Amino acid sequence: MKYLSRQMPGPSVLNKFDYRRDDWNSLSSNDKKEIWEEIIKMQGKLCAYCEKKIEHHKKNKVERHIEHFYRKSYYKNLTFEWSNLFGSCGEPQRCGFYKDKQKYNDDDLIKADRQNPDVFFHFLENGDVHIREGLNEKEHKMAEVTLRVFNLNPSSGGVKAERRRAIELSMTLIKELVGCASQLIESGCEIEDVRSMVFDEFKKNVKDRCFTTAIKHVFENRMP
Amino acid sequence: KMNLETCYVDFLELESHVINEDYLKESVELQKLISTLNESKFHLNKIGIHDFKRIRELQISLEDDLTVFVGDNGFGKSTILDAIAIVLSWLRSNIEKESKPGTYIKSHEVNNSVDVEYASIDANIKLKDFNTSILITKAKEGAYYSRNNELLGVKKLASIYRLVNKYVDNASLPLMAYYSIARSTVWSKFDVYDEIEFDRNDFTDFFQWLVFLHNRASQEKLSESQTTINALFSDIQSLKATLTQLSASTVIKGLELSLKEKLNYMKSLQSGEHKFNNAVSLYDSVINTILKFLPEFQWIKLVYGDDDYKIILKKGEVELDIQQLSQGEKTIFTLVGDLARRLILLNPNLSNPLLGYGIVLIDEIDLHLHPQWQQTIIERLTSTFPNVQFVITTHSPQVLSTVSSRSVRILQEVEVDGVNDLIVSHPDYQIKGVSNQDALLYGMRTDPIPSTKENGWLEEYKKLVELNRYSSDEALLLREKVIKHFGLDHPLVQECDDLISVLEFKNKINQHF
Amino acid sequence: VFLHNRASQEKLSESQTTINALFSDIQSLKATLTQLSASTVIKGLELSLKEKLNYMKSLQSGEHKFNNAVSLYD
Numbered sequence: 001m002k003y004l005s006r007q008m009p010g011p012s013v014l015n016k017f018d019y020r021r022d023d024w025n026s027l028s029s030n031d032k033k034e035i036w037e038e039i040i041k042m043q044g045k046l047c048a049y050c051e052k053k054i055e056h057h058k059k060n061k062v063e064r065h066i067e068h069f070y071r072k073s074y075y076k077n078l079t080f081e082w083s084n085l086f087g088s089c090g091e092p093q094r095c096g097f098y099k100d101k102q103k104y105n106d107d108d109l110i111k112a113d114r115q116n117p118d119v120f121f122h123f124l125e126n127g128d129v130h131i132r133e134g135l136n137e138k139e140h141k142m143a144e145v146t147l148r149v150f151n152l153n154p155s156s157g158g159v160k161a162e163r164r165r166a167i168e169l170s171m172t173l174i175k176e177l178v179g180c181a182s183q184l185i186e187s188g189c190e191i192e193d194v195r196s197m198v199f200d201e202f203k204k205n206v207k208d209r210c211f212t213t214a215i216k217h218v219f220e221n222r223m224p
Numbered sequence: 225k226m227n228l229e230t231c232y233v234d235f236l237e238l239e240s241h242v243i244n245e246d247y248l249k250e251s252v253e254l255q256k257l258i259s260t261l262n263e264s265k266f267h268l269n270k271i272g273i274h275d276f277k278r279i280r281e282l283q284i285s286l287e288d289d290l291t292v293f294v295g296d297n298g299f300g301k302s303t304i305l306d307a308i309a310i311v312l313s314w315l316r317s318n319i320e321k322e323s324k325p326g327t328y329i330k331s332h333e334v335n336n337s338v339d340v341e342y343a344s345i346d347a348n349i350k351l352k353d354f355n356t357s358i359l360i361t362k363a364k365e366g367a368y369y370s371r372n373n374e375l376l377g378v379k380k381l382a383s384i385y386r387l388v389n390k391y392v393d394n395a396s397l398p399l400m401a402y403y404s405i406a407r408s409t410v411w412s413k414f415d416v417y418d419e420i421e422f423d424r425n426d427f428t429d430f431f432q433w434l435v436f437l438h439n440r441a442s443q444e445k446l447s448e449s450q451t452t453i454n455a456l457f458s459d460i461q462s463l464k465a466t467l468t469q470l471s472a473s474t475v476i477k478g479l480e481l482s483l484k485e486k487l488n489y490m491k492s493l494q495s496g497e498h499k500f501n502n503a504v505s506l507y508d509s510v511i512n513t514i515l516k517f518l519p520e521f522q523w524i525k526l527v528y529g530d531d532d533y534k535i536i537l538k539k540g541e542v543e544l545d546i547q548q549l550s551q552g553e554k555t556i557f558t559l560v561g562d563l564a565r566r567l568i569l570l571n572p573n574l575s576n577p578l579l580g581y582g583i584v585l586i587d588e589i590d591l592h593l594h595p596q597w598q599q600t601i602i603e604r605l606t607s608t609f610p611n612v613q614f615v616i617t618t619h620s621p622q623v624l625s626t627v628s629s630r631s632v633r634i635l636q637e638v639e640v641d642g643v644n645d646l647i648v649s650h651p652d653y654q655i656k657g658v659s660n661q662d663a664l665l666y667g668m669r670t671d672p673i674p675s676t677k678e679n680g681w682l683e684e685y686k687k688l689v690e691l692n693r694y695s696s697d698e699a700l701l702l703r704e705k706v707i708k709h710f711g712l713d714h715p716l717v718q719e720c721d722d723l724i725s726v727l728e729f730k731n732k733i734n735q736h737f
Numbered sequence: 738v739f740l741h742n743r744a745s746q747e748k749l750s751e752s753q754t755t756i757n758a759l760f761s762d763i764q765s766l767k768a769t770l771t772q773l774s775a776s777t778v779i780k781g782l783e784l785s786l787k788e789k790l791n792y793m794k795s796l797q798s799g800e801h802k803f804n805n806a807v808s809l810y811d
């Protein structure tokens with residue numbers, strides 16, 4: 001995951017509803033379309049948790065649904081709160097559809113809006129996740145439990161197969177760019193001059209791609 | 225340092241002179257023969273063929289634990305298995321009874337070429353250091369074949385086994401099985417038959433055999449065996465009251481109770497037939513073997529409900545019925561069940577009957593199997609029974625990726641001196657742990673990517689991108705077709721577009737300095 | 738035959754445990770008859786036998802007449 005930059009609130013039709021109404025099912029189709037328009041604008045076209053593509057370049061449409069960060073039954077005070085809304089894929093073995101059937105302490109969950117996830121996780125070339133060292137016991141507890149509840153670190157198959165395929169498909173660009181950088185440092189130039197330019201070009205070419213964070217992390221390590 | 229034939233001639237020499245069966249039973253020659261025989265390993269070694277079906281002349285060497293044959297249709301994959309079946313038929317027939325005919329070669333199985341006259345098969349069986357060979361032949365029509373067959377070697381092995389089994393009971397015998405394709409006494413005591421051919425997808429018969437065996441098991445757990453149990457229970461209580469509970473003529477009472485209990489229990493338990501192969505031990509041994517083969521389950525049991533009865537399996541925290549299984553699971557169930565049944569019935573003396581010796585032939589192992597099942601069958605087969613020799617033929621590339629390159633043979637067809645004949649080759653790489661398409665391209669030498677018309681535009685476009693040409697109208701319209709068939713976000717399309725950015729940035733930076 | 742096998746299934750399982758323990762208590766009682774009739778250990782053993790018998794009578798076949806099995810066959 002990445003750090004989601006929440007914008008100024010735009011709930012619109014959500015303001016019309018109140019606590020007395022409750023009845024999440026009573027939301028109209030136009031209200032859902034407006035909410036999806038905002039979510040798409042803020043979130044891009046990728047899932048919040050697994051970063052799998054959720055919308056094609058518009059017959060069949062990818063399954064998607066709205067998720068609440070906190071459970072509705074326990075935290076009904078946030079049923080219509082704007083900060084509790086998220087977009088999730090329809091995969092029946094991970095993300096929202098998997099969070100429901102699990103027992104966990106909410107107070108020990110990572111929220112993409114509050115804290116930057118890059119301080120905990122560190123992906124590798126073959127698609128597995130490695131927890132960074134030097135963290136406190138509380139942080140290690142959160143990092144170790146969020147993957148378990150989200151099923152984002154399976155032994156084999158699942159998300160790991162797709163992450164590996166994406167990385168091996170994007171490996172050619174990384175190899176070429178690092179070759180150009182190595183050639184440019186074998187003649188003579190300022191390190192920050194070349195580094196800013198390569199980083200800018202690579203960042204420009206990786207916008208709106210599936211699993212962009214894994215390729216991101218796989219890029220700095222190879223880079224000198 | 226004890227050759228089998230040397231102890232054989234010593235034994236039969238001592239046996240000829242002495243006519244006392246009891247004395248011979250304790251003779252050290254018998255013990256030496258048994259000890260040396262048990263440590264030996266029964267492995268076939270070489271097979272030779274001549275003018276059989278499509279095959280003109282061939283010699284093949286087999287491994288000792290596993291061998292996989294890979295080829296296309298009509299390349300003699302089944303011919304090898306039928307050849308070995310004919311070779312083993314005569315040995316089995318001589319084992320059952322001396323001088324018994326085996327199975328012959330059908331007339332239509334001879335080669336149809338003009339200059340052919342006869343067809344012959346040769347074989348070699350190696351037992352530790354002892355060797356033997358056999359040759360069978362047949363003539364087309366009125367020609368002059370190689371006289372007659374040569375069974376001299378096989379009759380020595382049959383005589384050795386007959387002699388060993390005649391004096392000492394509950395001995396061991398080799399296992400020979402062949403799971404063919406559709407086509408179309410301890411064994412007699414329960415239900416089983418002595419045939420070399422067994423067919424899969426017969427789950428009904430195995431289901432009825434299992435329930436009938438369970439019924440006989442339960443019948444045997446009751447009756448007189450309960451009385452001995454009752455005595456044992458009293459023995460435990462009385463001795464406790466005399467020795468344990470007495471200490472929380474005590475010594476005399478305790479000694480008398482213990483002596484009487486030990487005497488009665490030993491006398492009753494010894495009286496009667498030995499354990500051997502009673503239905504109780506067969507049922508649980510078969511069930512435990514099946515459970516060991518599939519560790520994802522917890523238990524299997526037969527339940528008699530208020531109005532019906534069914535077999536229940538527990539996996540995780542779910543109870544499932546035997547009839548909810550797919551075709552692949554049923555096929556594996558009956559295959560392992562029959563293999564375990566034969567192994568248990570053939571080794572009544574070993575503590576762990578799964579350590580016997582034999583050879584198993586399987587044709588098209590990947591029938592009715594999901595791809596996720598194909599990637600684990602070999603390891604389980606080679607780990608449950610670790611002392612058996614397997615010969616397997618296959619078609620799927622997913623199975624190949626789990627087999628080491630030492631035990632794979634590839635059948636091809638080449639023409640030499642104007643005559644077309646088959647040849648056997650080996651892979652040029654290690655294909656254990658490679659992906660699906662790498663194994664398909666190397667282990668089988670085919671094309672992993674199809675030759676569809678849609679791929680033609682992709683190949684042409686990529687080639688055009690190589691020799692920088694991505695400005696011509698022809699390239700523009702080919703890009704239009706490609707982008708229409710696949711889409712903007714297809715990974716292949718993105719990878720193709722990546723090259724353009726690489727070149728553009730290359731000349732950009734190059735011109736910058 | 739379907740009825741008969743059902744009785745066998747009920748004849749096994751936990752019905753054997755109460756059968757064995759009560760038999761053991763009977764054997765102990767028989768020993769009390771012997772040894773010239775010998776509190777403390779005797780009181781504890783008698784209390785344990787009484788508790789086991791009370792537990793088995795409390796079960797009352799679990800389903801009582803409903804269990805059937807043997808009763809229906811006979």
Ligand SMILES: Nc1ncnc2c1ncn2[C@@H]1O[C@H](COP(=O)(O)OP(=O)(O)OP(=O)(O)O)[C@@H](O)[C@H]1O
Nearest residue numbers: 277278297298299300301302303332333334335336
């Ligand atoms: N009498 C014969 N003379 C010559 N060739 C024969 C004769 N009978 C069969 N053949 C050849 O046998 C070939 C098929 O052999 P075989 O049954 O071993 O093939 P396979 O594909 O390996 O079998 P399977 O699908 O059973 O595993 C045919 O292509 C045919 O040319």
Ligand SMILES: [Zn+2]
Nearest residue numbers: 047050089095
């Ligand atoms: Zn997702």
